[PDB]
From a paper:
The structures of [name] and [name] are entirely α helical, both comprising seven α helices and adopting the Bcl-2–like fold. We show that both proteins are Bcl-2 family members but lack a surface groove for binding BH3 peptides and, consonant with this, are not anti-apoptotic. Instead these proteins have acquired the ability to inhibit signalling pathways that activate NF-κB.
A52R is an immediate-early VACV gene encoding a 23-kDa intracellular protein ([name]) that contributes to virus virulence. [name] functions by inhibiting NF-κB activation downstream of the IL-1 receptor and TLRs via interactions with IRAK2 and TRAF6. The structures of two independent crystal forms of an N-terminal truncated form of [name] comprising residues 37–190 ([name]ΔN36) were refined to 1.9 Å and 2.8 Å resolution with residuals R/Rfree = 0.177/0.215 and 0.181/0.192, respectively, with residues 40–189 being observed in electron density maps in both crystal forms. Residue 190 and the first two residues of the polyHis purification tag were also visible in the low-resolution structure. Both crystal forms of [name] contain 2 molecules per asymmetric unit arranged as a dimer, the overall fold (0.32±0.07 Å root-mean-squared displacement [rmsd] over 150 Cα atoms) and dimer interface being highly conserved. Given that helices 5 and 6 contribute to the central core of the protein, it is unclear whether this truncated protein would be stable and natively folded let alone whether it would dimerise like the native protein (900 Å2 of the 1,300 Å2 of surface area buried by the native dimer interface being abolished by the truncation). Further study is therefore required to identify the binding face of TRAF6 on the surface of [name]. Superposition of our structures onto that of myxoma virus M11 in complex with the BH3 peptide of Bak reveals the hydrophobic BH3-peptide binding grooves are occluded in both [name] and [name], but not in N1. Residues 92–94 and 117–122 block the groove in [name], the C-terminal ends of helices 2 and 4 being oriented closer to each other than in M11, thereby narrowing the groove significantly, and the side chains of Q93, F94 and Y118 pointing directly into and filling the groove.
Residue numbers in the entry:
A (entry chain A): 40 to 192
B (entry chain B): 40 to 190
The structure:
């Protein structure tokens, strides 16, 4: 039995990166951010700054992708597919931004009470981020948490 | 890719009973009941009446098990185990009541904001309800979706 990552402060080798993301999008997509999260989720939450810098503001995407419309989730998927196409050589930082983007998008859906749409973030991650990139993200989060430890003490 | 069951109105052979329960406890345990549910979840929601009749009120269970305490989830699991060892011959209706019981319990945890504890309901289901009983429950829910239409 694996741990619950909502209030998890670590990221060990035994922890699966995708599962962390599954729970992250479930919890953020259903409960939102006004909740106690652990150091782990708190790090992933910072991916939001990246996403805005790379893909634009959520207010813009919301209008352009018509996120809250019936075709909103399908549009988001096509948009993600378009992003993956258009980027010349994908870096781990693209993948990080992309996650932050999903997070911001899931916020829009939660507020609209389209609660089942958090699933689409996972579908998008699967399309955008391969196992090799998930490893690199996990390695980065592990480093970032080690520094958060130093900062604390 | 399987469907999302939050607003699902059916229950087909291809739908796995455990997965339905996974999502049910996730959604009820995190969002609660003031949400649009499909006919499927609405049926499982009725398991609540069963649970009260068989295991007692949630107010009492909450006090007896001290559900919101640090040991609350472990206590609930113990409770489930005890109840199972105790039942001479387990019926599908015992399993149904037990699910309703988990549902009522998850409500307590949600209100306390112990949001990760919904997982324990699944752990409890796995202990209490074998695949054979899950099939019988699925069969009943399939009938009930029909019975409801009739009415």
């Amino acid at each position: 039995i694996k741990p619950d990552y909502l209030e998890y402060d670590d990221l060990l080798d035994r922890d699966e990166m995708f599962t962390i993301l599954e729970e992250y999008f479930m919890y953020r997509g259903l409960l939102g951010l006004r909740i106690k999260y652990g150091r782990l989720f708190n790090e992933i939450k910072k991916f939001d700054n990246d996403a805005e810098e790379q893909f634009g503001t959520i207010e813009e995407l919301k209008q352009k992708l018509r996120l809250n419309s019936e075709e909103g989730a399908d549009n988001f998927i096509d948009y993600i597919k378009v992003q993956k196409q258009d980027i010349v050589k994908l870096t781990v930082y693209d993948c990080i931004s992309m996650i932050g983007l999903c997070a911001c998008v899931v916020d829009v859906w939660r507020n609209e009470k389209l609660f089942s749409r958090w699933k689409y973030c996972l579908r998008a991650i699967k399309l955008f981020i391969n196992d090799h990139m998930l490893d690199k993200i996990k390695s980065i989060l592990q480093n970032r948490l080690v520094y958060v430890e130093m900062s604390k003490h």
